[PDB]
Amino acid sequence: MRALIVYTELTDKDSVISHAVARLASELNDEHVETVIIRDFEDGLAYIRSNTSIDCLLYGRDMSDRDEQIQAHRLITQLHRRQEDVPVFLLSDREEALVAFDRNMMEQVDEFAWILEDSADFIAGRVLAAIQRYRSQLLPPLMKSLIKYSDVHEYSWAAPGHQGGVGFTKTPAGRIYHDFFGENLFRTDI
Amino acid sequence: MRALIVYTELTDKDSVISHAVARLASELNDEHVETVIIRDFEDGLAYIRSNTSIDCLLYGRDMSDRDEQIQAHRLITQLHRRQEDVPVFLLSDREEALVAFDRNMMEQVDEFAWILEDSADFIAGRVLAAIQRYRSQLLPPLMKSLIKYSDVHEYSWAAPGHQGGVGFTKTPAGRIYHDFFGENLFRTDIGIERVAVGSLLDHTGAFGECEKNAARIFGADQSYSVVVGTSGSNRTIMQACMTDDDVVVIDRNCHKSIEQGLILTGAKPVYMIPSRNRYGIIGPIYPKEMTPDAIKFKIAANPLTKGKVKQKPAYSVVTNCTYDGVCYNARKVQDLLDGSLDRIHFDEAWYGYARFNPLYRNHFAMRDEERTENEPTIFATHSTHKLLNALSQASFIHVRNGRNAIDFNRFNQAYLMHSTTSPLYAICASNDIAADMMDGNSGRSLTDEVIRESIDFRQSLAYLYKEFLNDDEWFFKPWNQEMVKDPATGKRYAFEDAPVELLMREQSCWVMHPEDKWHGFNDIPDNWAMLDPIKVSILAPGMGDDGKLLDTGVPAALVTAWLNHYGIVPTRTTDFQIMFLFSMGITKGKWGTLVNTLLSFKRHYDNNTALKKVLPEVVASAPEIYGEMGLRDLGDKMFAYLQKNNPGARLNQAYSQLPQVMMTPRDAYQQIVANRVEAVPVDQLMGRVAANSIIPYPPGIPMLLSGENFGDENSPHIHYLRSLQAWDSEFPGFEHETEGTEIIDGQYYVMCVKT
Amino acid sequence: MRALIVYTELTDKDSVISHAVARLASELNDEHVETVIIRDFEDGLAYIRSNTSIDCLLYGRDMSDRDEQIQAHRLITQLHRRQEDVPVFLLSDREEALVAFDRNMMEQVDEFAWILEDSADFIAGRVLAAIQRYRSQLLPPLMKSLIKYSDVHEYSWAAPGHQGGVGFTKTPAGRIYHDFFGENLFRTDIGIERVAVGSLLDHTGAFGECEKNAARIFGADQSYSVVVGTSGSNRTIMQACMTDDDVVVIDRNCHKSIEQGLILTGAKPVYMIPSRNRYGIIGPIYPKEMTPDAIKFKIAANPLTKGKVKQKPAYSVVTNCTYDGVCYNARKVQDLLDGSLDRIHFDEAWYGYARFNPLYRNHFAMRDEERTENEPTIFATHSTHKLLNALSQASFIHVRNGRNAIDFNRFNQAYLMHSTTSPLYAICASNDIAADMMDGNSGRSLTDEVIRESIDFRQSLAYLYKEFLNDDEWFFKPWNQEMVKDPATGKRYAFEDAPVELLMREQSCWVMHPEDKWHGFNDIPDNWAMLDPIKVSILAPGMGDDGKLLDTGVPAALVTAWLNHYGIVPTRTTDFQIMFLFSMGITKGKWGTLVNTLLSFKRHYDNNTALKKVLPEVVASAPEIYGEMGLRDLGDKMFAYLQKNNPGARLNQAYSQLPQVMMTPRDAYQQIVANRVEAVPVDQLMGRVAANSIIPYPPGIPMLLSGENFGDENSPHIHYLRSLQAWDSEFPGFEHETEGTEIIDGQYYVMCVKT
């Protein structure tokens, strides 16, 4: 689980939003969500264009700058090009977000995170729930069912004879072959 | 122990104050006080608004800047909103603080710390002493005594048998259960024979202290903690109040525990009929039903009570607020009922927070008001687990003694009659912590947070509705005022454009005015009812303002199926109405998920997405019907069915006319005990007397009570039951719930008295 | 996951098997299975007898030694006593195991592990699969579903308001409370609207599964889980059974919930009077009170029921076992009452384990027996928190359908009438885990452990009593048989010399025989009653076998004060009797503390130690009286008072004669509701009707019920109340408890019906 945080300047003084984001990142790391913190939308765009899996996007902008609004929309569109249903959290001061609220905002924002008046634990829990929801719909059906069944290791009394690759690990050459191709390939040959 | 240090610029050169603060922080850490150092008051405010426990605040400012003075005062006020008695230390140069010394300074400063001329060890010791003093007063009495006793681990030679959870740790399944629930839960299950804590049923010790504290906090003369919920509380109040030789005035919008009390007391009930609107939402009882002449007329017309027209009614019950958030003006209700009764019971099961926010002023039972000596006795029941923070089955009885009051010795008999001899002390502890949570500034702060969240959701939904309407599209709309008026300046706003402070402060922005069309309660008097902001109803399109359906619409059953598929479970639902609860357990900005879910439903509805892709569980009910069918196809099918059958008129007919009463509820139940009852299908209900209550959903309030006749062939009640059955047959997976019926092979059966 | 490896000598040279086992243990640790390696079967037995969870047993022996075979079988049987389905792997050389292969081997071996010719990885994988299979079947259904659902953390938009405990973590006191009780308790408080788990009141889902499982385990046709304790269970049973037009047969040794049921139903009660002994211990009802002629005579003699002599009684209740551990032969009681009634209710609140130990055979309600079709309907109520392992308020209703049975639809009305709409699921989960704990081998093993501990205490106390008697000194003695007879060989033993196996196996060692003097129930039939071993009564000296006091003695009130000072709180107490509870939560050898405390009391009593040194709390009551007074001085003062006043005769007079009945308990309570009651002092009680029940301690059972006359000047009941008041006045700090009275300035007041 990896969360990407892209915020530029939410408060007139940087330290407030920086400390709030640091607290949120600590709470996310305590629940085993890795966090990447980025201060510029072009840097975030470059990060997204690297084929790195992102499970959640949390972003905030100036909220009074239309250029940063365009940049944020570009970032979210780029993210959804290849990672289509990744949850997007808006990090913002509540009043600024509420005055900017409209249909176009909700077209790209899935959840609100009032970073300056909410506990980092509550936001981290909501982020984790969103990440789990996203991960549960990610795989296509056959691949999902095969992965789910692959954990079974019991000896069936039927073919194939290698029985999830166990048969190969009885001669040294078979063991080399089994280690080369890996266990999961043989455990899906069911 | 955590100390928060907020200082900005105390010296012209930063290094002096920074080094002094560093020395103080080191000395505080050496005494195991964690320190958070913050250089800006806005950062400190953000830190305080995170629900982190702070045991001491040490702050310093420029001391010559009035803006920083205002900021520091704001920080301290914010801290004391939810952490009321946290000590505040002023860090300052001595001369600067002394020249600024006044009453206003001492109102917010508890101690002085001359950080530049005092040893950090002395200040750290004083801080630790202050923290210990603060921590020693933090817990409410029952919880404190339970925690203190929990350290005892010796085997008592008495019940409970598990002996602080030791008994569970003897089988593997017991060990898993014990590890899951934790040790402290079992170590507080100590029985009623430990004099260190006291006993709940005797109201002694910490239990007596907790009940006195709760009575003070909730503004009652006496309070009783209950471990059988508001069902139990209602039963004991009704048992203490009435007898089988009594006539009582019952809100027809009554919980089933009220009918249980009627069965257990044998009293003869007379009913006040609440109002209804075009959405099927049950509204308030109008004042025309509570007048002394109306009550005398009801008593004289009732078949069972017509020989008691000279007898003063012994008890009345009004549900406030209602299930859909309609709050009575309780002062006016009490004044109306004072002309006929000496005992008024307000069943405020969903309404426990009302005392602690000024928005609800005059709309609840235990008001801060000058009390005269000729008032009636007032009872209020709170389900502390519903909209306060308590475990299930926790409840309170609040009593204000007036005319014909019941003294403690008499009331205790009913209390014991509906209680248990072995209460679980965790439930009472949750009651105590809930009362403590509403005490002082914290109750106001928590109610404010919930109200603000609900208002943000309502305004956002209204804005989206207007946007979609401007694009000539449909959307959901919140059920509140369309336009609000500022009573000070006279300025009018659209609801979504109104300032949040105005909606949070002004009660008239939520009062049901007779000239407004939004609420739909025709002929309601002004300043009679009010909408609770935190019970948010949303309306699906399809119902016209006149009361008849439009040409197109989206039935709420399909939206409910969508929400259930996404895990959201509404509290109430009608044909076009979905109710969402905002509680003190909600987190800020959570309603964005609700808005997102509604928008995605609208997208899939406009796209006519196949039910197999979006709602597989709906398809799994009747795969031959819902297979190869889209979301909008099903929606239009349901709306066409509603247009053809018009079940709203059926509901109005069934609930505008009361059923004929044949016997008291106790007599009907004793027919059950005597085995003189049978299961009767709906088509054979004509002339039959129901053995138990029939509560259809919607509207969720009883259509028939025990001992009431179903009526002849043209009876609206049998017609409404038939309508619900027909809907269930036509739409599998969207079946209505009806308490008091048995559904065999999809057919309704009702237990009726054998003729 | 923990695997236990027990191997002694598999190969002629130890290093081969040791290295193979080391490789296997390394492979098991690499898959996160902890391993305990033991080289001796006695060490493995000791390890198993420690309550440590074992997920798999891998063992090997010599395979040519029959002694090691017996030891291994013993080890596996011991393991499955409390860990029933743990997989067992046989570690062996292949040929040795194959030559020893038979049915008896396969009865205890689940899998083979050829440790000397198989890879440790293959065996480790098979062990892990077996462990996972075992763990997946370990939990009972409701607990399993609750644990599975507990991982959900999303904000539902419905009650409870705390939303999995989030609401508590918003004030500092709430955070302390939340951390104390832990997260999992609040995350299981989910409400009745989560279909993944089901609903308790609808008996659907995991709740239906749990109730079916409990009915199977306890041998009932149907079982109901109750969250209002046995008080609630008794109320719902009585509400389902009787009506105000009914006559009922009530054990005079009844809990106050039985009288509450009488008040709530309005039935007319007739009473069976239990027996008493010289110590004031209430004994069983004799068969002469349950015969059809006796019941007809009681009905014909009762002032209220004499117009119902042709009516079959609708309900009877018998408390079994009693508070002092007297257990009826329930088969004989049922056969006696079958001639008059169709419904028998056994209130087994203290008697829930009885089904699971053969020592209690035929002495409980839900017996494993061939059932005919003409049996009466049997109800049994268990307080699962009393002598089973459950949280307070957990209870069960068990039904065996017979004549005039109540079907589910009719019974559910009473069940809902005495329940709450928001049950706390932790209580139901505790009920489910208690039922699971009694299931299979574990119930027998746990009851055996408790019974053996109680027998060890009884025998040690009897031995010490004999030793002190031989030294012509006084001591406490257990209340059981002095001499026991072995029914097989005919050999007689003194109780302290009897083999423990005989006392644990033979029921006749605990039956009350009419020829024995220990129990003191004169004219009791043989094979009628039986003593529960785990309810241990000890007798202080002072009472003669004839029924009159001796020249000297030690009153039990002083011993009770001593025990309270040391933290031990007895369950019951009379003038010379102290009752101690042995429960499944006791640990082995704990009764040594009790013996030590009694010995130290005897030392300080013989030394006449000043009460200030030993019992400062006693002195703090009346420092002018107890100051400068010794332990033996106070004891002799109390004994002289008892000798002069003889309150035991007062108790016998008060309880041998029943008070005159003036009205039903419901009528008396409705006098309270009508405010027609007053507080009356004891000296003015002549001719007055009690408004509530009077329960003096001793004997702890009601002397008067509601609606019963106190009597004239010479009434024994007023005399007994006066005796208790006089004792309270003479000995501050040793005051009797009397439910149903108010003590103002040390004077007794009783609520009575205004004439």
Author numbering:
A (entry chain G): 1 to 190
B (entry chain T), C (entry chain O): 1 to 755
Text lifted from the article:
Bacterial homologous lysine and arginine decarboxylases play major roles in the acid stress response, physiology, antibiotic resistance and virulence. Inducible AAT-fold basic amino acid decarboxylases (LAOdcs) have been studied since the early 1940s1,2 because of the link between their enterobacterial pathogenicity in humans and their ability to overcome the aggressive pH environments and oxygen limitation in our gastrointestinal tract. Here we show that the Adc from a multidrug-resistant human pathogen Providencia stuartii massively polymerises into filaments whose cryo-EM structure reveals pronounced differences between Adc and LdcI assembly mechanisms. Like all proteobacterial LAOdcs, the P. stuartii Adc monomer is organized in three different structural parts.
Moreover, as we observed P. stuartii Adc by cryo-EM with the goal to solve the structure of the decamer presented above, we discovered that most of the Adc double rings were linearly stacked to create double-rings and longer filaments. Consequently, we solved the structure of the P. stuartii Adc stacks at pH 6.5 that was used for protein purification to a resolution of 2.15 Å. The atomic model of the decamer stack reveals that upon polymerisation the conformation of the Adc decamer remains extremely similar, with minor changes localised to interfaces between monomers and dimers, and at the interface between decamers. Specifically, although the diameters of the LdcI and Adc decamers are very similar, the height of the Adc decameric ring is 105 Å compared to the 90 Å height of the LdcI decamer.
